[PDB]
Design a binder for this molecule. Sequence first.
Ligand SMILES: [Zn+2]
Ligand SMILES: [Zn+2]
Lengths: 155, 155
Amino acid sequence: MLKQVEIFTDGSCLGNPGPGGYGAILRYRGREKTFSAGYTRTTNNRMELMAAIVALEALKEHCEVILSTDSQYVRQGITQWIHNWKKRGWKTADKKPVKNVDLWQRLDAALGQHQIKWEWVKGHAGHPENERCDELARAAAMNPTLEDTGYQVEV
Amino acid sequence: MLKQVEIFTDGSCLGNPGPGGYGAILRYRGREKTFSAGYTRTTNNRMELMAAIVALEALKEHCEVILSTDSQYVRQGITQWIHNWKKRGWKTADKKPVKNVDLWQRLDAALGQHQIKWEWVKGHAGHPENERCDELARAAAMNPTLEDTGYQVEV
Ligand SMILES: [Zn+2]
Ligand SMILES: [Zn+2]
């Protein structure tokens, strides 16, 4: 069996678009690693993707990963959109580029390395690791230091 | 003096995108009138715009409108970007069409018809008519009968 790892992710955004941040925890046999960063103009959806991206990309070997997130956007993409995107050349049915394609592909690239068990939590209440990642994400959205270069401004 | 009228608006969407509806209430000196409709695949933000559009377009003369909504998206658009969009011709700084431009332009056309005084409510508790609009909108989302022809599918 592969090294099993727990990943917790969340994102936060003050607007749409607006200052935003992501939070992520990577735990292996008790030891924890935290990821967070804040951006001056982004979306909640993109922060939810970045949190999963940066945690998965930290993995230095093939792993069995339990990925816990309350993002409805990540759930709807993984369970409902990604298959059609793969067989469509990463375009919509109308043959147009998909939104946040830069991050969906980067996330899909990290997914191929590992065996992923997604656990879709209801909210962040109750689970301490999921509350800790919203704290990092919300704190980062309140203190942004970077530019989301991949966000194509729609307003 | 202008006829004063109260208008309450809300939207609901079961996905992003997914089935959705809008709910609006028009009130003229105690008397009350409702508007609502459900769409098969739309977004919550587009339903928030539709709610104010349908209620404002129902007025038959110049009015004083107390327009109450809890929509962050509508509030962001009005209080931040509505002036820049007109000055730029409904384009972004990058010379690209703004998101949901079809509904923002239609709302701007209706808003220019009356003297609008917005009341940004913060929640559903303690706001009966706003709560009704959420109920009207959710009922419509549960019984979609129309297609959001202006929604450009992003997935
Ligand atoms: Zn959360
Ligand atoms: Zn509401």
